Design a protein around this ligand. Sequence first.
Ligand SMILES: [Mg+2]
Ligand SMILES: [Mg+2]
Ligand SMILES: [Mg+2]
Ligand SMILES: [Mg+2]
Ligand SMILES: [Mg+2]
Ligand SMILES: [Mg+2]
Ligand SMILES: [Mg+2]
Ligand SMILES: [Mg+2]
Ligand SMILES: [Mg+2]
Ligand SMILES: [Mg+2]
Ligand SMILES: [Mg+2]
Ligand SMILES: [Mg+2]
Ligand SMILES: [Mg+2]
Ligand SMILES: [Mg+2]
Ligand SMILES: [Mg+2]
Ligand SMILES: [Mg+2]
Ligand SMILES: [Mg+2]
Ligand SMILES: [Mg+2]
Ligand SMILES: [Mg+2]
Ligand SMILES: [Mg+2]
Ligand SMILES: [Mg+2]
Ligand SMILES: [Mg+2]
Ligand SMILES: [Mg+2]
Ligand SMILES: [Mg+2]
Ligand SMILES: [Mg+2]
Ligand SMILES: [Mg+2]
Ligand SMILES: [Mg+2]
Ligand SMILES: [Mg+2]
Ligand SMILES: [Mg+2]
Ligand SMILES: [Mg+2]
Ligand SMILES: [Mg+2]
Ligand SMILES: [Mg+2]
Ligand SMILES: [Mg+2]
Ligand SMILES: [Mg+2]
Ligand SMILES: [Mg+2]
Ligand SMILES: [Mg+2]
Ligand SMILES: [Mg+2]
Ligand SMILES: [Mg+2]
Ligand SMILES: [Mg+2]
Ligand SMILES: [Mg+2]
Ligand SMILES: [Mg+2]
Ligand SMILES: [Mg+2]
Ligand SMILES: [Mg+2]
Ligand SMILES: [Mg+2]
Ligand SMILES: [Mg+2]
Ligand SMILES: [Mg+2]
Ligand SMILES: [Mg+2]
Ligand SMILES: [Mg+2]
Ligand SMILES: [Mg+2]
Ligand SMILES: [Mg+2]
Ligand SMILES: [Mg+2]
Ligand SMILES: [Mg+2]
Ligand SMILES: [Mg+2]
Ligand SMILES: [Mg+2]
Ligand SMILES: [Mg+2]
Ligand SMILES: [Mg+2]
Ligand SMILES: [Mg+2]
Ligand SMILES: [Mg+2]
Ligand SMILES: [Mg+2]
Ligand SMILES: [Mg+2]
Ligand SMILES: [Mg+2]
Ligand SMILES: [Mg+2]
Ligand SMILES: [Mg+2]
Ligand SMILES: [Mg+2]
Ligand SMILES: [Mg+2]
Ligand SMILES: [Mg+2]
Ligand SMILES: [Mg+2]
Ligand SMILES: [Mg+2]
Ligand SMILES: [Mg+2]
Ligand SMILES: [Mg+2]
Ligand SMILES: [Mg+2]
Ligand SMILES: [Zn+2]
Lengths: 12, 140, 204, 37, 174
Amino acid sequence: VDKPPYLPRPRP
Amino acid sequence: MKTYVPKQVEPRWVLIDAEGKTLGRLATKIATLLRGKHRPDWTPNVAMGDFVVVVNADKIRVTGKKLEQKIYTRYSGYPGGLKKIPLEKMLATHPERVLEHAVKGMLPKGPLGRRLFKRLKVYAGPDHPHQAQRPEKLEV
Amino acid sequence: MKGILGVKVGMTRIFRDDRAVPVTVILAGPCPVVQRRTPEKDGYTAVQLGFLPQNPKRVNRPLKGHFAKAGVEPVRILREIRDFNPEGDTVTVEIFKPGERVDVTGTSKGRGFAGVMKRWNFAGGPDSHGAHKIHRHPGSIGNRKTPGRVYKGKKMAGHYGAERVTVMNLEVVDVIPEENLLLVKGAVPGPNGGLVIVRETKKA
Amino acid sequence: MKVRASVKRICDKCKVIRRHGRVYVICENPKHKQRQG
Amino acid sequence: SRIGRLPIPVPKGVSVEVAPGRVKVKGPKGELEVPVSPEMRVVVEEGVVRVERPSDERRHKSLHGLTRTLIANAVKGVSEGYSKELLIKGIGYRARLVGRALELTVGFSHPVVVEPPEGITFEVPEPTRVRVSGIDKQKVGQVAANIRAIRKPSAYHEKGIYYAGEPVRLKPGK
RNA sequence: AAGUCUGGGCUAAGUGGUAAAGGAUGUGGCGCCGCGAAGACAGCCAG
RNA sequence: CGAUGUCGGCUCGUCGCAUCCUGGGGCUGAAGAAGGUCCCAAGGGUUGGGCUGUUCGCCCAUUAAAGCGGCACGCGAGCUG
RNA sequence: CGCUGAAAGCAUCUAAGCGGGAAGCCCGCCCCAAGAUGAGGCCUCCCACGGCAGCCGGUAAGGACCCGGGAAGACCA
Ligand SMILES: [Mg+2]
Ligand SMILES: [Mg+2]
Ligand SMILES: [Mg+2]
Ligand SMILES: [Mg+2]
Ligand SMILES: [Mg+2]
Ligand SMILES: [Mg+2]
Ligand SMILES: [Mg+2]
Ligand SMILES: [Mg+2]
Ligand SMILES: [Mg+2]
Ligand SMILES: [Mg+2]
Ligand SMILES: [Mg+2]
Ligand SMILES: [Mg+2]
Ligand SMILES: [Mg+2]
Ligand SMILES: [Mg+2]
Ligand SMILES: [Mg+2]
Ligand SMILES: [Mg+2]
Ligand SMILES: [Mg+2]
Ligand SMILES: [Mg+2]
Ligand SMILES: [Mg+2]
Ligand SMILES: [Mg+2]
Ligand SMILES: [Mg+2]
Ligand SMILES: [Mg+2]
Ligand SMILES: [Mg+2]
Ligand SMILES: [Mg+2]
Ligand SMILES: [Mg+2]
Ligand SMILES: [Mg+2]
Ligand SMILES: [Mg+2]
Ligand SMILES: [Mg+2]
Ligand SMILES: [Mg+2]
Ligand SMILES: [Mg+2]
Ligand SMILES: [Mg+2]
Ligand SMILES: [Mg+2]
Ligand SMILES: [Mg+2]
Ligand SMILES: [Mg+2]
Ligand SMILES: [Mg+2]
Ligand SMILES: [Mg+2]
Ligand SMILES: [Mg+2]
Ligand SMILES: [Mg+2]
Ligand SMILES: [Mg+2]
Ligand SMILES: [Mg+2]
Ligand SMILES: [Mg+2]
Ligand SMILES: [Mg+2]
Ligand SMILES: [Mg+2]
Ligand SMILES: [Mg+2]
Ligand SMILES: [Mg+2]
Ligand SMILES: [Mg+2]
Ligand SMILES: [Mg+2]
Ligand SMILES: [Mg+2]
Ligand SMILES: [Mg+2]
Ligand SMILES: [Mg+2]
Ligand SMILES: [Mg+2]
Ligand SMILES: [Mg+2]
Ligand SMILES: [Mg+2]
Ligand SMILES: [Mg+2]
Ligand SMILES: [Mg+2]
Ligand SMILES: [Mg+2]
Ligand SMILES: [Mg+2]
Ligand SMILES: [Mg+2]
Ligand SMILES: [Mg+2]
Ligand SMILES: [Mg+2]
Ligand SMILES: [Mg+2]
Ligand SMILES: [Mg+2]
Ligand SMILES: [Mg+2]
Ligand SMILES: [Mg+2]
Ligand SMILES: [Mg+2]
Ligand SMILES: [Mg+2]
Ligand SMILES: [Mg+2]
Ligand SMILES: [Mg+2]
Ligand SMILES: [Mg+2]
Ligand SMILES: [Mg+2]
Ligand SMILES: [Mg+2]
Ligand SMILES: [Zn+2]
């Protein structure tokens, strides 16, 4: 069930 | 004056006829004999109880519907490895394990009680192979 | 419940009734009984069998004593057939007739440290579409914090083969007593030259 | 065999039996046979 | 309003000796041993056996009647013996005695063969009638029931194996 | 660690050792109506 | 909140049973065959496709059956993105 | 689903007792396994070696090392 992602995808 | 502590004494051997006795109530007494709490010089940190030989283990008796309802249990560590064995079968297959499993759970945990359980020699059927030790017959 | 030691020699096929029959040839006989296990002496019933002639130069003194108590020449391999008590002092291929049905125990070929795809027939990962260095990998081996561990027996990579395998209900296609041969229909574990055991089948 | 929490008599021929720790209802009419559960 | 109080008439010449927890009953047809609660007293008077209960408790009252009827049946068993008749209905359905054993032809793709257990005798007077006779009451009724079960009465047709004196109750088709 | 302590009773469900409407010849115990040796109830029969 | 990476897929499973199938039953407005409904049963099984990121769902062709749920909506120091 | 059977003169698979009954349960089949420290069993082999349940040393039955290898194998085994 599509719920909003709580973390951004990690950056360098 | 510091409390008396016994040096090692010769262990007494005892014989019990388990026939017709109530499982749990015979268990406690054997545990007691094993601990050595019947000796005035009891000391909790050493093995100074009696050696206890039990005969006619298969002829132990039990109240209520436990023969069908008491479930002994063993877990192997694998998935779905919980084995349930009812009392009926345990007596039918390894009867001496009944008195053994009972008495064991009434002994203290740890190194000592673990070695006390070794001083329990239980046999199903009227004969025991310890005539050499000349065991003293106990009424309990 | 009869039995006999032997060696796998190899496979061919023969023709029986306009039909090709894949067979494995086993050099079975002759097997000298060197000890009998008895319920009074050993608590169960079995017959210790010997197999293959041995150079007595290689047989140590403990072993030599054993062979003498049976009055039997030195032998390379000892194995027991349980619940078998032959009348004779020697077992040959004669105890099986063609048409009978047998179980063969052997040592499976060893695949050494085997991957999960060969060992456990896993399906592994994709070979394109982004698959990143996991083509022959197992994937997940568990859950999360509950239970937070791996099951005993969890199928993983590791050694595979060089292990005891018994194949059952194999038809005896022929027996050639003059050469101690046994012709069994189908596949038997192990390499050619590997040791096998041939027992009467326990199937119905 | 109707299984339910409320077992009762349906007709005057129905009979309430307690059998092996359970409350059954047996009767000449097969439709009325009940066990409590 | 009471069974176990009633005395058991004991015909001649059958013997009823009392033992701890059992009674032994001999007669012109054989012997029978009746297990009896230690709590119940079995008493042997002239040509009459009586059973007495130790109190008016619910358990003892139940054991009491049961004990009597148990011993009563054992007496009648060695004297008159017990028997049940089975009636066979249906077009192809027959029975025939193959030696001591009973063969049953009741519509299956094969015939059924029933062996007499110890103390049981099968007899086939007609083709559609079967008699199970023995000195043991429960053993007879059991063997009877077993033989009936082989092809129970239908609910739609007068077909199958019946008890004698067993009502044919059916329901309509279509 | 200290009672297999004493006396009276209940429970046979391991109830004790997690739950409700409702259901029930569980068991024991107090009542309350009927109907019965002017022969009741069960039934075992004649009609 | 001096970080417990968040859907779906893939992979690998394991459990629950309120059982989709197979096994065993009672009732049926159960003739038979086939169904209905409830009870017992978790041993095994539970297919391939088209649409869409989809889970889900619809559809094709089959099937004994194409079960429903838990495991951080199991599984990103295993992959995908 | 029954047989026999009281309490409850009848009835009742149950309160005494006994049957039948599932791919399920236990055994059975295949594999691991005595670190099963509860360390099992059988067959066979060596022995009363020197000096002072211990220490050093020389052996026995045996074993390891080393080497040629192996449908055994990462090393090891
Ligand atoms: Mg004492
Ligand atoms: Mg008890
Ligand atoms: Mg044992
Ligand atoms: Mg403590
Ligand atoms: Mg030929
Ligand atoms: Mg081998
Ligand atoms: Mg290899
Ligand atoms: Mg792999
Ligand atoms: Mg494989
Ligand atoms: Mg493959
Ligand atoms: Mg694949
Ligand atoms: Mg591939
Ligand atoms: Mg792909
Ligand atoms: Mg990438
Ligand atoms: Mg990458
Ligand atoms: Mg790549
Ligand atoms: Mg992976
Ligand atoms: Mg944990
Ligand atoms: Mg290996
Ligand atoms: Mg209602
Ligand atoms: Mg009404
Ligand atoms: Mg009725
Ligand atoms: Mg008399
Ligand atoms: Mg008197
Ligand atoms: Mg119809
Ligand atoms: Mg007391
Ligand atoms: Mg309960
Ligand atoms: Mg409890
Ligand atoms: Mg509880
Ligand atoms: Mg209530
Ligand atoms: Mg009530
Ligand atoms: Mg009445
Ligand atoms: Mg946070
Ligand atoms: Mg940090
Ligand atoms: Mg931190
Ligand atoms: Mg269920
Ligand atoms: Mg079915
Ligand atoms: Mg079904
Ligand atoms: Mg039908
Ligand atoms: Mg129809
Ligand atoms: Mg049905
Ligand atoms: Mg299942
Ligand atoms: Mg499972
Ligand atoms: Mg499942
Ligand atoms: Mg496509
Ligand atoms: Mg959708
Ligand atoms: Mg179909
Ligand atoms: Mg169908
Ligand atoms: Mg699909
Ligand atoms: Mg998730
Ligand atoms: Mg999910
Ligand atoms: Mg990642
Ligand atoms: Mg993901
Ligand atoms: Mg994760
Ligand atoms: Mg995830
Ligand atoms: Mg993770
Ligand atoms: Mg993207
Ligand atoms: Mg009856
Ligand atoms: Mg009973
Ligand atoms: Mg039975
Ligand atoms: Mg039974
Ligand atoms: Mg039956
Ligand atoms: Mg099968
Ligand atoms: Mg082995
Ligand atoms: Mg060992
Ligand atoms: Mg071993
Ligand atoms: Mg242990
Ligand atoms: Mg050993
Ligand atoms: Mg042994
Ligand atoms: Mg040497
Ligand atoms: Mg090498
Ligand atoms: Zn009714």
